[PDB]
Amino acid sequence: MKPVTLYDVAEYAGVSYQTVSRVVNQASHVSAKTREKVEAAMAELNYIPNRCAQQLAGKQSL
Amino acid sequence: MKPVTLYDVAEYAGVSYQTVSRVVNQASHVSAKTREKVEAAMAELNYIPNRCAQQLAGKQSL
DNA sequence: CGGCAGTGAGCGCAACGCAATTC
DNA sequence: GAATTGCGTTGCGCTCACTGCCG
């Protein structure tokens, strides 16, 4: 009925959303405490980068 | 890559971006004389009406 | 006044930047 | 002392749909 959404992982992790997807995107100065939770959320809901809102968001390819 | 979307094909045909997409969704009364014209222009300019954008667009599923 | 096109807005993830604050 | 948090949006194509543009 309903697939996965980044917003779900954000709320499950209890973080500012940005910190979640940045771990699989380009995490740099993220505290171990912060990544600890977001990893749990990403693995819990199974976060798969879908090809839809990626091209549209303004990627290097439409 | 060239960001030629329904916005660029509009001016090229002398219309808006709705006449262009008109044939992509249903292809109803497209001016009656510009139905095949836009379709041809699409193939000519190698215009690609996305792949997943039209899905998240006009969802109306909520 | 009537046909038929055009604009408007929303959906989703992704990214920028410098200093104060917390660990 | 050095890590680390953030903010908050747009915005893009693309859709529908009603309403206005041009006649």
Swiss-Prot record, chains A, B:
Residues 6-25 bind DNA. Residues 1-58 form the HTH lacI-type domain. Removing residues 1-59 results in loss of DNA-binding activity but retains tetrameric structure and inducer-binding activity. Deleting residues 340-360 results in loss of tetramer formation, but retains dimer formation, inducer-binding activity, and DNA-binding activity (if residues 1-59 are present). Repressor of the lactose operon. Binds allolactose as an inducer. Homotetramer. This is Lactose operon repressor. It comes from Escherichia coli (strain K12). The lineage of its organism: Bacteria, Pseudomonadati, Pseudomonadota, Gammaproteobacteria, Enterobacterales. The gene is lacI. The chain holds residues 1 to 62 of 360 of the full protein.
